[PDB]
Structure 1
Amino acid sequence: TQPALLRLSDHLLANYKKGVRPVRDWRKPTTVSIDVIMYAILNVDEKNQVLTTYIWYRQYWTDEFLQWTPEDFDNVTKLSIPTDSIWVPDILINEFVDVGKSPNIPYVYVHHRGEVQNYKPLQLVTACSLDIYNFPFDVQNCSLTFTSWLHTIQDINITLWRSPEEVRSDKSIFINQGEWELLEVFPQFKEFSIDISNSYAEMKFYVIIRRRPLFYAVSLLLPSIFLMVVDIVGFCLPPDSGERVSFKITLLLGYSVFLIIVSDTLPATAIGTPLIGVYFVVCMALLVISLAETIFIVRLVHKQDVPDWLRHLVLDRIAWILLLQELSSIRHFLEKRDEMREVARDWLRVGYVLDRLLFRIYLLAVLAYSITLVTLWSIWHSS
């Protein structure tokens, strides 16, 4: 006598058709459960609005023809079969824009009551809407819809194998060391008809993820905050100090390089914009502004007199704030060291006033930036 593992495999696979749906009455569908686990988050391309994941996609369904009596064959109740030798459902992710590179599992299991169990390490790449407004603290609701491309609901009703609560909690297999965390995955059924009789079963999986903003924080914000503080203290100087002006130039160069670094190297998609680079743009803007202002005042150090305009403007401004003759050749030579103050000094002083006012409001800008930052931190920690 032969092995029953041969005799049964000879029985079940002979006179079988991989194309014909495995059912005796066509009017019934062949229902298909699934189960999804997130092994890891391989990569997140914020620019192209796509996602890279690796999952352990299980699958279960029934085949009327893959049935036997265990007692007739060695009391056997399971059997390995090649997946390519039987009918298989053409499940497909709606967001699957590009083919996933993953190895084909050459076998499946079968039970003595038509059941089938196909597991595989499905790797996938999908599209997703990615918000960059909270760029370090970004949290997403990327989706994974599961369905047949063609087979209607009347042939294939997608279902779930595990219970949904069990699915959301399941973090049995995950690599936390990645840049991106994972919070849960909510499954939900849906029916989908673009037009009549095109009913298609569906099973959405609201994948949720959270970024670890530590690295971005230390790498980006703290250098920016140091730049902010050096601008803050640089404004303390008196305007026509020349290398006060060159110091604002130094800060301009640093801010320029950093602002450049943002979309040089850091992810910044075209849709929307993050507020962080916005605030940095603003601070650089105010820097160059008062760079021009102290330069204006430096021109005004040279005797130059528009003081009427200036004067009523500062009034409204602060309203809104609410032989011996020859040895006196040498005397005059001395006092000419600062005799030009009689014109230079009014404009010098009011320029100093501008410097300090502008300094206060720039400080307020940096304050708003920090407030926003702490708000985003709290929101990130909120879930």
Structure 2
Amino acid sequence: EFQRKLYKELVKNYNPLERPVANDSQPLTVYFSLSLLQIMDVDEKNQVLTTNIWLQMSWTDHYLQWNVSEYPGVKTVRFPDGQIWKPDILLYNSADERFDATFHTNVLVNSSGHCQYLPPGIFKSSCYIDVRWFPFDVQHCKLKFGSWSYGGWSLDLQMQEADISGYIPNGEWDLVGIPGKRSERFYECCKEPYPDVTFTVTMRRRTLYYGLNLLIPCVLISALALLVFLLPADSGEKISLGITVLLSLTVFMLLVAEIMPATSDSVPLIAQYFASTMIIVGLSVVVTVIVLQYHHHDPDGGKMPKWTRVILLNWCAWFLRMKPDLAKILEEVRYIANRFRCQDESEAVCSEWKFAACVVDRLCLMAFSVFTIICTIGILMSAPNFVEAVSKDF
């Protein structure tokens, strides 16, 4: 009875085009904020952030004011889209094909005219994803909101601190905060300035998932590559194991490519670590070829360069702690035995070459192990957030 009477009363002469101010010259203060409920997705390949947001726009409509003594029990009213004047606050850096993913709900006014509008929405925003430090990355994704067609002389946008009480954790991202900032910028279209409120969603990637699925698996598969330096050459599978492991490591780069954007701003840390890993494994294949050249060396070929005979079989070897008828019968039997002596000398030369191959195996085992350890640690601890990560997520 009083809700009916008031609803009829409030739409007499009301125009949803008129900015609801009493004095036309003064701008209309709109307080803007948001409640972040969830970080639904971070599409780094497409540079998009999908969030569940409850935008919070509060202002004062000069015309929607009633005296509750004359409408007992009627303390608030609600208006759907298109019936009340609303601020046309859009997300500037939107990535949604419709460009406006907001779901239009009611505007709740009280007896004093204060209008409250809390549209829910799944919002896609074009966010620059700094992949320089991935997986130990922190992203600062801006959500820039402003009135599209009202300038500062008409809509005085004011910012209120972001709401995160109802935020639901993600699993992959630790909300580090949503600091906001109000700016007054000038545009090349127009002379009247335009204010905007930009909320910078700061997100820390939780590194356990990518650590367990990308970093540690590659470390351990990369470690298998070093087993080539412990394999004997006579097994006939050094090259097979090494080349198989290297070409298996490409799957991780393929996975990263499925994740990372095709940008040239920088090289992600994961790529630099994966690249150094493959280069070290590839150099192990090159060194395996050299080792097999030493092992399969023709004894009657070139002689052993003194530089090799000392740099490897003396120093590096020590460092590693390795270490008438009867005359015709005499002639024939002496050729057989001299042939055997020549074969013994050839085996001895081949044995020394095989020893050189083994010494090289051990030196490169040590050197590639040290290279792996340093490169891995020095590339991973070059991330500013590395320590924070290992402490929080492991």
1:365–1:125 distance in 2 versus 1, CA, 3 Å: same
1:211 aligns with 2:218: no
Counterpart residue number, 2:11:
13
The normalised TM-score by structure 1 is 0.84
Q: Distance in 2 between matches of 1:303 and 1:237?
A: 26
Counterpart residue number, 2:95:
97
Q: Distance in 2 between matches of 1:138 and 1:171?
A: 22
Contact 2:144–2:198 (CA under 8 A) maintained in structure 1: yes
Q: Partner letter of residue 150 of structure 1?
A: S
Contact 2:207–2:389 (CA under 8 A) maintained in structure 1: no
Q: Residue 71 of structure 1: SS of its match in structure 2?
A: coil
Q: Distance in 1 between matches of 2:128 and 2:22?
A: 43
- Aligned-pair identity (%): 29
1:44–1:344 distance in 2 versus 1, CA, 3 Å: same
Deviation digits for residues 232-278 of structure 1, max 9, x if unmatched? 23213455763233332332343344444442x44454333323322
The normalised TM-score by structure 2 is 0.82
Contact 1:101–1:124 (CA under 8 A) maintained in structure 2: yes
Q: Partner letter of residue 200 of structure 2?
A: Y
Equivalent runs, 1:56-71 vs 2, <5 Å: 56-71=54-69
Q: Residue 43 of structure 1: SS of its match in structure 2?
A: strand
1:192 aligns with 2:185: yes
Q: Distance in 2 between matches of 1:121 and 1:142?
A: 19
Deviation digits for residues 298-342 of structure 1, max 9, x if unmatched? 553463229659659959xx89xx934544444345445443246
Counterpart residue number, 1:292:
289
Q: Distance in 2 between matches of 1:366 and 1:69?
A: 77
Equivalent runs, 1:1-383 vs 2, <5 Å: 3-74=1-72, 76-98=74-96, 99=99, 101-105=101-105, 107-161=106-160, 164=161, 167=162, 170-195=163-188, 197-237=191-231, 242-263=236-257, 265-267=258-260, 269-271=262-264, 272-274=266-268, 275-298=272-295, 300-301=297-298, 303-305=300-302, 323-341=329-347, 344=350, 347-368=353-374, 369-373=376-380, 376=383, 377-380=386-389
Q: Distance in 2 between matches of 1:179 and 1:8?
A: 50
1:129–1:338 distance in 2 versus 1, CA, 3 Å: farther
Q: Partner letter of residue 24 of structure 1?
A: A
1:301–1:43 distance in 2 versus 1, CA, 3 Å: farther
Contact 2:38–2:170 (CA under 8 A) maintained in structure 1: no
Contact 2:39–2:52 (CA under 8 A) maintained in structure 1: yes
Contact 2:292–2:357 (CA under 8 A) maintained in structure 1: no
Contact 2:37–2:167 (CA under 8 A) maintained in structure 1: yes
Q: Distance in 2 between matches of 1:22 and 1:153?
A: 15
Counterpart residue number, 2:323:
none
Q: Distance in 2 between matches of 1:382 and 1:150?
A: 48
Q: Distance in 2 between matches of 1:288 and 1:259?
A: 19
Q: Partner letter of residue 26 of structure 1?
A: D
1:379–1:324 distance in 2 versus 1, CA, 3 Å: farther
Unaligned runs of 5+ in 1: none
Deviation digits for residues 89-125 of structure 1, max 9, x if unmatched? 11011211323545331x2211222211111112210
Q: Distance in 2 between matches of 1:192 and 1:382?
A: 41
How well do the aligned residues superpose, as a CA RMSD in angstroms? 3.2
Q: Distance in 2 between matches of 1:228 and 1:75?
A: 74
Q: Distance in 1 between matches of 2:6 and 2:261?
A: 59
Contact 2:81–2:104 (CA under 8 A) maintained in structure 1: no
The number of equivalent residue pairs is 370
